Design a protein around this motif. Structure first.
Motif, mmCIF file in Angstrom:
data_model
loop_
_atom_site.group_PDB
_atom_site.id
_atom_site.type_symbol
_atom_site.label_atom_id
_atom_site.label_comp_id
_atom_site.label_asym_id
_atom_site.label_seq_id
_atom_site.Cartn_x
_atom_site.Cartn_y
_atom_site.Cartn_z
ATOM 1 N N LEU A 1 0.841 -1.184 0.000
ATOM 2 C CA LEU A 1 0.000 0.000 0.000
ATOM 3 C C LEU A 1 0.881 1.241 0.000
ATOM 4 O O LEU A 1 2.015 1.207 0.476
ATOM 5 C CB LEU A 1 -0.895 -0.008 1.241
ATOM 6 N N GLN A 2 0.334 2.336 -0.531
ATOM 7 C CA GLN A 2 0.932 3.646 -0.359
ATOM 8 C C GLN A 2 0.280 4.303 0.852
ATOM 9 O O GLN A 2 -0.853 3.976 1.198
ATOM 10 C CB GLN A 2 0.752 4.484 -1.626
ATOM 11 N N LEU A 3 1.015 5.213 1.500
ATOM 12 C CA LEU A 3 0.442 6.032 2.555
ATOM 13 C C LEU A 3 -0.676 6.882 1.964
ATOM 14 O O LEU A 3 -0.568 7.349 0.832
ATOM 15 C CB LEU A 3 1.525 6.927 3.163
ATOM 16 N N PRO A 4 -1.772 7.124 2.716
ATOM 17 C CA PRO A 4 -2.843 7.995 2.240
ATOM 18 C C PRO A 4 -2.357 9.440 2.166
ATOM 19 O O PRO A 4 -1.479 9.838 2.930
ATOM 20 C CB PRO A 4 -3.953 7.824 3.286
ATOM 21 N N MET B 1 -2.734 12.790 3.213
ATOM 22 C CA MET B 1 -3.408 13.441 4.325
ATOM 23 C C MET B 1 -2.541 14.563 4.889
ATOM 24 O O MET B 1 -1.356 14.665 4.578
ATOM 25 C CB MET B 1 -3.713 12.435 5.439
ATOM 26 N N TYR C 1 -5.851 15.195 11.319
ATOM 27 C CA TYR C 1 -5.523 14.818 9.953
ATOM 28 C C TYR C 1 -6.787 14.684 9.104
ATOM 29 O O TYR C 1 -7.848 14.317 9.606
ATOM 30 C CB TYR C 1 -4.746 13.501 9.913
ATOM 31 N N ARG C 2 -6.633 14.963 7.804
ATOM 32 C CA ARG C 2 -7.716 14.875 6.838
ATOM 33 C C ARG C 2 -7.134 14.595 5.455
ATOM 34 O O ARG C 2 -6.009 14.996 5.164
ATOM 35 C CB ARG C 2 -8.511 16.182 6.801
ATOM 36 N N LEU C 3 -7.913 13.916 4.609
ATOM 37 C CA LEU C 3 -7.562 13.752 3.209
ATOM 38 C C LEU C 3 -7.719 15.093 2.502
ATOM 39 O O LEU C 3 -8.691 15.806 2.740
ATOM 40 C CB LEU C 3 -8.483 12.706 2.573
ATOM 41 N N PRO D 1 -14.411 15.580 8.942
ATOM 42 C CA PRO D 1 -15.498 15.251 9.868
ATOM 43 C C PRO D 1 -15.314 15.786 11.287
ATOM 44 O O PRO D 1 -16.295 15.977 12.003
ATOM 45 C CB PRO D 1 -15.513 13.714 9.921
ATOM 46 N N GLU D 2 -14.054 16.012 11.689
ATOM 47 C CA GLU D 2 -13.744 16.452 13.040
ATOM 48 C C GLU D 2 -14.375 17.822 13.276
ATOM 49 O O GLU D 2 -15.072 18.025 14.268
ATOM 50 C CB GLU D 2 -12.234 16.509 13.287
ATOM 51 N N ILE E 1 0.179 -6.195 5.221
ATOM 52 C CA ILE E 1 0.295 -5.160 4.156
ATOM 53 C C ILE E 1 -0.109 -3.800 4.742
ATOM 54 O O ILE E 1 0.413 -2.785 4.252
ATOM 55 C CB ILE E 1 -0.507 -5.566 2.902
ATOM 56 N N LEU F 1 2.617 0.024 7.106
ATOM 57 C CA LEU F 1 2.470 1.500 6.954
ATOM 58 C C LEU F 1 2.815 2.218 8.263
ATOM 59 O O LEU F 1 3.364 3.333 8.175
ATOM 60 C CB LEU F 1 1.038 1.840 6.534
ATOM 61 N N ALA G 1 -3.958 8.204 12.146
ATOM 62 C CA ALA G 1 -4.445 8.873 10.919
ATOM 63 C C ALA G 1 -4.294 7.915 9.732
ATOM 64 O O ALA G 1 -5.305 7.666 9.043
ATOM 65 C CB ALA G 1 -3.698 10.161 10.693
ATOM 66 N N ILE G 2 -3.092 7.364 9.531
ATOM 67 C CA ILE G 2 -2.789 6.437 8.398
ATOM 68 C C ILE G 2 -3.820 5.302 8.387
ATOM 69 O O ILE G 2 -4.320 4.971 7.293
ATOM 70 C CB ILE G 2 -1.351 5.893 8.474
ATOM 71 N N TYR H 1 -7.416 6.363 7.319
ATOM 72 C CA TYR H 1 -7.549 6.717 5.880
ATOM 73 C C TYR H 1 -6.962 5.630 4.972
ATOM 74 O O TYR H 1 -6.842 5.889 3.756
ATOM 75 C CB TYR H 1 -6.916 8.084 5.622
#
Ligand SMILES: [Mg+2]
Ligand SMILES: [Mg+2]
Ligand SMILES: [Mg+2]
Ligand SMILES: [Mg+2]
Ligand SMILES: [Mg+2]
Ligand SMILES: [Mg+2]
Ligand SMILES: [Mg+2]
Ligand SMILES: [Mg+2]
Ligand SMILES: [Mg+2]
Ligand SMILES: [Mg+2]
Ligand SMILES: [Mg+2]
Ligand SMILES: [Mg+2]
Ligand SMILES: [Mg+2]
Ligand SMILES: [Mg+2]
Ligand SMILES: [Mg+2]
Ligand SMILES: [Mg+2]
Ligand SMILES: [Mg+2]
Ligand SMILES: [Mg+2]
Ligand SMILES: [Mg+2]
Ligand SMILES: [Mg+2]
Ligand SMILES: [Mg+2]
Ligand SMILES: [Mg+2]
Ligand SMILES: [Mg+2]
Ligand SMILES: [Mg+2]
Ligand SMILES: [Mg+2]
Ligand SMILES: [Mg+2]
Ligand SMILES: [Mg+2]
Ligand SMILES: [Mg+2]
Ligand SMILES: [Mg+2]
Ligand SMILES: [Mg+2]
Ligand SMILES: [Mg+2]
Ligand SMILES: [Mg+2]
Ligand SMILES: [Mg+2]
Ligand SMILES: [Mg+2]
Ligand SMILES: [Mg+2]
Ligand SMILES: [Zn+2]
Lengths: 154, 47, 142, 116, 53, 101, 110
Positions: free
Chosen positions: E21-24, E26, E35-37, E43-44, G19, G23, G34-35, G38
């Motif tokens: 996976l890649q980190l999101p 954020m 944190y937020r996308l 939402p906070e 997986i 992260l 957070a990670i 999301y």
RNA sequence: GGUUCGUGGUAGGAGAGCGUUCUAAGGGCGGUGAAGUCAGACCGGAAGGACUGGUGGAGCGCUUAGAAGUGAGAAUGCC
RNA sequence: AUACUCGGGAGUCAGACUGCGAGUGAUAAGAUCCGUAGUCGAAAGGGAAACAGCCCAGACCACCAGUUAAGGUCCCCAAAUA
RNA sequence: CCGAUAGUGAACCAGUACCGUGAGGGAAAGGUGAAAAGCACCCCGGAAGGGGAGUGAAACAGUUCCUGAAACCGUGUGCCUACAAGUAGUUAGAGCCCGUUAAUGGGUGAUAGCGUGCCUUUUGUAGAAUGAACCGGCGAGUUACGAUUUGUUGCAAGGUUAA
């Protein structure tokens, strides 16, 4: 063996086509719960050497005891009543302090009983003297009357 | 009884076949390769 | 035990300049291979590279005895079906002499990782002028 | 009495796997491939105890050849020279002098030239 | 059709170099402080970080 | 000053105070060992042997009479059910060189 | 000094948990949480509860500074496999491994 | 104890041994830690055997004899 | 430096190529069938690029010593640009 | 004689479960601790599951819980690795990292030489012939009675008893 194990009757799957090793019974010896191939069968292990060799053996083991000075020849050996304390005291007076075979002739019922509970000590008639019984014990205490009976046979 | 020595040469160790190649009687266990004489219960009657 | 073994960067590697003029392509190549490999040094160690750097000048004047000029063919295959190209030693001595000597010498070097490092120490020039004057190359005779 | 196959098997197989320490992947883990790898390693080591003796003589000869050609002798002439001279110094000792004490090697090379 | 040889541990692990996976994407919001996308509503705070709802 | 001596069917280059391993020699740990077979003497006057330098000797004291690290010699022939395992420990003498003469 | 939480025999395949766990390894707990929030994976909620449990342990039991915590260690060990069967064509049944995971998270100061 | 000649090897013959479970008898070890298990750069010509430390938590060696369900890498072996 | 005799225990009864002498074949076959010798089989080592059967030669173990065999000595590659 | 793949098919609610129309076929599955003293209470979590605290000789003995090998799956890192052609080693060998049952030591391995698994079956197999996914356990010249021959022992022109 594979015949004596419960079940086994049928061929587990057809000879050809299934891609499995050919098998004849689920009790064949390579199967987990299957028959044993050879392994123990009830049998006697007993055998006797000729009489003359058996007499030589008792003569020779008894001669060995005299040579080593393990044979103690007692005049009497008797007890008024069955008393283990008295028999234990007797062994200290003779200075045994090992395993010992005691051989006696005269009925002496009290001698068998008095020695019964002692761990290294075996009392036998004299008719019953055997190579293995003499070999199992360090000292051999014998009554004069018993010596007479042993010489009478040998 | 802790020093028993049977007469020298009166007793010999039995030969055990089929217990590895080092012994010289491994695998085919002295029977050589194939034919009637290599089989369990194999061999022709006496004469 | 006790036999000496050269370490990397222990043995002083020198720069040699060799005139190819009139020397058989082989004969020049076989001597140069030995210099590259370090066979001329007592420190020679088969796993290390103790050899010298070689500049060859005048490679256009390299000798090809007999009818080799016209009859010695150099082949390349692309690995495509029917992809076999050919050049005569003569044509290659005229147009790409640096290539001709490199092929000749590459064939005489060990066919391994160290052999590929040795090849990097070889500089071939068609004419009389190189640009490695900084390395203070010393003339070498065959 | 029954003898179950207890411990002797594990002890024997574990020794073979320990001898395969450092081998690639399954070869240092699994008895069947470790046992092949160990047998083969022993066979190579036997072969190479003989090859080692050949390899070192080739190294010495090459170094003696290099140092002798610096004195305008080939290895074939020098060794003939030393034989005629009666010098019994072996190739391992000559190769050692040719690297470590070239002055001494030159002295022997002179003794060789004189005998020729 | 079928694997000719089992795949070694090394080869299996090399194949999985890219299975991850890649980190999101954020970042911390100012109004929320959490944190937020990016390009999403937080939402906070309970709305879009910039545009109040 | 270094010498080349013949010991145990081999040649070895010795200097003073050097510790060498050779093939087993007769000698207790105290004992002094004299090498009479000297092929070459070096250091500012190369004395060369035809083949042994007459009256030249190296003296050494025996430091240890030992057996080298265990070697396992194992042969086999594939498909012929032939294997042969043998242990080996080569005897040696660890000498310290006293003087070249 | 450090605080650990474990979720033993969680009914998720180890590969699927790993997986994600990969992260958060080495990250500050705030960023880690957070990670996971999301990362749209079935494992994310499960790993979040283990991580928040480890943080609660660090704060309540060992009196560590929660604002200062980093995911020192995180790893997934195989749990006991549930063995199932799917009926396939021609009367044959194929094995199904319903694998389980032991999910460990260790948090530490810095 | 020397001398001399030997010491590649499949089928196969011959010999000497290693190790496993059990029995006897002697003699021991063990809660101050048995067996098992893990690790190690130790010892023997081989099969193999110790030592030290971890784990383990209660049984086990050794000597001489005896008896065998006595040694596995392959059987599209069985679990 | 073995023969022979008498006992105990075997395995083997698919052979292969090479050279030489024959048949069969086409004076073909890595063919086939005998005779005779060798090697392989059951033989590692060196040479013949690689290459059971050809050339040289037999591995008890260790050595970072030496001399030779076939085959080699310009470079790969040890040794003559004899 | 066996000691949980053994010994009965069955140490356990087994001729059970399960399979089969039926006759019939027919398993797997033993061990907390001396004692439940079987984890009050607090914490995260819906729970599960954890972390403390407590019990205990021990809980890395926590209700399937003595020991706990190997395959297999992971985390961490000392050495190596992105110009190389690899039966994976071996011999030579720098460099780097260690420090032992103290040994002409241990780990790794740039680079160089050499090098076609094991088994079976074959005249001949690296074999493009056979067998094995891996690890573990289990898995094949036995016993009885005769014959014969060698060794040993007793007695010897005698020797030996069987039931
Ligand atoms: Mg039946
Ligand atoms: Mg299949
Ligand atoms: Mg049948
Ligand atoms: Mg059963
Ligand atoms: Mg059974
Ligand atoms: Mg025997
Ligand atoms: Mg044989
Ligand atoms: Mg076999
Ligand atoms: Mg067969
Ligand atoms: Mg046949
Ligand atoms: Mg036959
Ligand atoms: Mg259907
Ligand atoms: Mg032999
Ligand atoms: Mg020989
Ligand atoms: Mg035999
Ligand atoms: Mg036991
Ligand atoms: Mg265990
Ligand atoms: Mg068995
Ligand atoms: Mg298996
Ligand atoms: Mg033919
Ligand atoms: Mg012929
Ligand atoms: Mg054959
Ligand atoms: Mg050969
Ligand atoms: Mg070759
Ligand atoms: Mg072969
Ligand atoms: Mg030689
Ligand atoms: Mg010569
Ligand atoms: Mg050369
Ligand atoms: Mg059972
Ligand atoms: Mg058990
Ligand atoms: Mg459990
Ligand atoms: Mg690179
Ligand atoms: Mg390139
Ligand atoms: Mg297969
Ligand atoms: Mg008989
Ligand atoms: Zn916001």
């Amino acid at each position: 063996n594979r015949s004596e194990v419960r079940g086994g009757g049928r061929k587990p799957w057809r000879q050809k086509g299934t891609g499995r090793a050919r098998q004849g019974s689920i009790r064949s010896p390579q199967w987990r719960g299957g028959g044993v191939v050879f392994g123990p069968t009830p049998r006697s292990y007993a055998y006797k050497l000729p009489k003359k060799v058996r007499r030589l053996a008792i003569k020779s083991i008894l001669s060995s005891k005299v040579n080593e000075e393990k044979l103690v020849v007692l005049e009497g050996l008797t007890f008024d009543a069955p008393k283990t304390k008295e028999f234990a005291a007797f062994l200290k007076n003779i200075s045994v302090d090992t395993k010992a075979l005691i051989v006696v002739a005269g009925e002496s019922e009290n001698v068998e009983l008095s020695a019964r509970n002692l761990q290294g000590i075996t009392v036998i008639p004299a008719e019953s003297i055997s190579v293995l019984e003499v070999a199992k014990h360090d000292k051999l205490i014998i009554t004069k009357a018993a010596v007479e009976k042993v010489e009478e046979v040998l | 009884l802790h020093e028993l020595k049977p007469s020298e040469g009166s007793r010999k160790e039995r030969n055990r076949v089929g217990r590895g190649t080092g012994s010289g009687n491994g695998k085919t266990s002295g029977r050589g390769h194939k034919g009637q004489k290599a089989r369990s219960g194999g061999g022709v009657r006496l004469g | 035990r006790t036999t000496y073994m050269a370490k990397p960067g222990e043995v002083e590697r020198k720069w040699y300049v060799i005139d190819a003029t009139g020397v058989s392509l082989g004969r020049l190549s076989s001597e140069v291979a030995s210099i590259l490999r370090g066979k001329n040094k007592p420190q020679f160690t088969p796993h290390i590279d103790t050899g010298d750097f070689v500049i060859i000048i005048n490679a256009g004047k390299i000798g090809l005895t007999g009818k080799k000029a016209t009859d010695k063919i150099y082949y390349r295959h692309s690995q495509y079906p029917g992809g076999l190209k050919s050049r005569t030693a003569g044509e290659m001595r005229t147009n790409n002499p640096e290539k001709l000597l490199e092929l000749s010498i590459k064939g005489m070097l060990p066919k391994n990782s160290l052999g590929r490092q040795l090849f990097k120490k070889l500089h071939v020039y068609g004419g009389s002028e190189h640009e490695h004057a900084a390395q203070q190359p010393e003339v070498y005779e065959l | 009495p029954r003898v179950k196959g207890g411990t002797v098997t594990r002890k024997r197989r574990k020794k073979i796997v320990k001898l395969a320490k450092g081998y690639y992947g399954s070869k240092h883990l699994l008895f069947k491939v470790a046992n092949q790898a160990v047998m083969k390693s022993y066979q190579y080591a036997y072969r190479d105890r003989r090859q080692k003796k050949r390899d070192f003589r080739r190294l010495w000869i090459a170094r003696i050849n290099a140092a002798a050609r610096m004195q305008d002798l080939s290895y074939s002439k020098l060794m003939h020279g030393l034989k005629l001279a009666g010098i019994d110094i072996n190739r391992k000792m000559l190769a050692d002098l040719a690297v470590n004490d070239i002055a001494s090697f030159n002295t022997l090379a002179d003794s060789a030239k004189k005998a020729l | 059709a079928v694997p000719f040889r089992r795949t070694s541990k090394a080869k299996k692990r090399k194949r999985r170099t890219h299975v991850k996976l890649q980190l999101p994407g954020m970042n911390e919001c100012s109004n929320c402080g959490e944190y937020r996308l990016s390009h999403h509503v937080c939402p906070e705070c309970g709305q879009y970080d910039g545009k109040d709802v | 000053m270094y010498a080349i001596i013949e010991t145990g069917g081999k040649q070895i280059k010795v200097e003073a105070g050097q510790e060498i391993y050779v093939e087993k020699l007769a000698g207790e740990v105290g004992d002094v060992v004299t090498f009479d077979k000297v092929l070459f003497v070096g250091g500012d006057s190369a004395k060369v042997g035809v083949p042994f330098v007459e009256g030249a000797t190296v003296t050494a004291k025996v430091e240890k009479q030992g057996r080298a690290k265990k070697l396992t010699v194992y042969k086999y022939k594939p498909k012929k059910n032939y294997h042969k395992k043998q242990g080996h420990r080569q005897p040696y003498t660890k000498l310290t060189i006293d003087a070249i003469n | 000094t450090s605080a650990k939480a474990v979720a033993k025999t969680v009914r998720i395949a180890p590969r699927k948990a790993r997986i994600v766990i990969d992260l958060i390894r080495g990250k500050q707990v705030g960023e880690a949480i957070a990670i996971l929030k999301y990362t749209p994976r079935s494992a994310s909620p499960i790993i979040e509860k283990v991580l928040k449990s480890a943080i609660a342990n660090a704060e309540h039991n060992y009196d560590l500074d929660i604002n200062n915590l980093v995911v020192e260690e995180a790893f997934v060990d195989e749990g006991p496999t549930l063995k199932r069967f799917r009926p396939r064509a021609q009367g044959r049944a194929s094995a199904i491994n319903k694998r389980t995971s032991h999910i460990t998270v260790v948090v530490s100061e810095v």
